[PDB]
């Protein structure tokens, strides 16, 4: 539970070698509305494969 001899800022870096946020670059474009949602999701205006699905 304790540290006896403080690790350098070197090894503090290499522990942070894998924290990097996964990119969500894979956007989609609508079939018959042309707008952009996230893939397998709905827009801000209720479109999903060219349908007013939620009408909100």
């Amino acid at each position: 539970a304790v540290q006896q001899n403080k690790p350098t800022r070197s090894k503090r870096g290499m522990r942070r070698s894998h924290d990097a946020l996964t990119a969500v670059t894979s956007l989609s474009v609508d079939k018959t509305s042309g707008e952009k949602h996230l893939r397998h999701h709905i827009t801000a205006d209720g479109y999903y494969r060219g349908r007013k699905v939620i009408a909100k």
Binding site: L21, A23, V24
Partner: protein
């Protein structure tokens, strides 16, 4: 022509804003707005509210061009601390320091 926008004293820590403002290093703006609109975090609330304020400083003060407009440098740097006192058990306290951070967004056409 070059322009810079800064949010000073953003109420978080440096590694919390370093992680999403690592992806938008060396990007164009419209792919950066689209990688920050759908990153599910709090720093993506922070700097995406400021990264759009940087392109405002282009279209208004510097180069109105936004289509082919790059982001050159972005580096979140530390700020002050709100050193409150946290109570730990058995009578002893604990000097908490609520962290605070500064972010620059630098926008130009290299």
């Amino acid at each position: 022509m070059e322009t810079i926008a800064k949010h000073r004293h953003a109420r978080s820590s440096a590694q919390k804003v370093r992680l999403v403002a690592d992806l938008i290093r060396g990007k164009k703006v419209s792919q950066a707005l689209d990688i920050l609109t759908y990153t599910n975090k709090k720093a993506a609330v922070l700097v995406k509210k400021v990264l759009e304020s940087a392109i405002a400083n282009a279209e208004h003060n510097d180069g109105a061009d936004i289509d082919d407009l790059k982001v050159t440098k972005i580096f979140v740097d530390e700020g002050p601390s709100m050193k409150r006192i946290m109570p730990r058990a058995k009578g002893r306290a604990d000097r908490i320091l609520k962290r605070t951070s500064h972010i620059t967004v630098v926008v130009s056409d290299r």
